[PDB]
Structures are given as C-alpha cells and as structure tokens.
Amino acid sequence: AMSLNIITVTLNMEKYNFLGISIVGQGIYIGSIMKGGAVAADGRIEPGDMLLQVNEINFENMSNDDAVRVLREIVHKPGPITLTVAKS
Numbered sequence: 001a002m003s004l005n006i007i008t009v010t011l012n013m014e015k016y017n018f019l020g021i022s023i024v025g026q027g028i029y030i031g032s033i034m035k036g037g038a039v040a041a042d043g044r045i046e047p048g049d050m051l052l053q054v055n056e057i058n059f060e061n062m063s064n065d066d067a068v069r070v071l072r073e074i075v076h077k078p079g080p081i082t083l084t085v086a087k088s
Ligand SMILES: O=C(O)c1cc(Br)ccc1NS(=O)(=O)c1ccc2c(c1)CCCC2
Pocket: 017, 018, 019, 020, 021, 022, 023, 037, 067, 068, 069, 071, 072, 073, 075, 076
C-alpha cells in the first residue's frame, strides 16, 4: 500500500486575500509560491506539485490562460478553497 502521493488541502481564506501562487504548463504545476498568501501560510503545497482539482474544476487538460482565469474567479468568491495536488 505505497502512497499515491495525492494530497487534498482546504484553505479557509478568512485572513488571506489570495492563494499567492504562480502556475506553469498546459499538466498545470505550481511554478512558485508568494509570501503573504494562504498557500505559503498553510505550507503543505510546494512548487512542482501538479494541480488536479480546485473546488469543482478539474485542471488535468486546461490551457494556462484558462487555468489563470478560473483561479481568479475562484479566489474572487468568498469561502473555503480546496486544492487536490499530485506530489509525484
Ligand atoms: O490567488 C492567486 O495566487 C492566483 C493565482 C493564479 Br495562477 C491566478 C489567479 C490568482 N488569484 S487572483 O484573484 O488573481 C489574486 C492575486 C493577487 C491578489 C488578489 C487576487 C487579491 C488581493 C491581493 C493580491
């Protein structure tokens, strides 16, 4: 029962305006993590992690443009953000 290295992270976003991440690729990967963001504060998500799902949206075959657009609309809405990432 070796780990599949799939981790799910729920951020409450009460104290943070933004995830504070950049993304690369077209899978979609965490390119970098910004200081002062909810992701940096939580600390679980790292650069090179592959983005599988954020809230109700799957990211597995999505353009970089479409990924940036969807993430803004998700971060714009108030309430928790759940990210599912592949660490392998
Ligand atoms: O929240 C992010 O880090 C983010 C990442 C990508 Br990739 C695309 C969009 C993102 N969110 S965002 O709504 O554009 C955003 C980015 C920065 C900030 C905000 C929103 C809110 C004010 C503080 C600075």
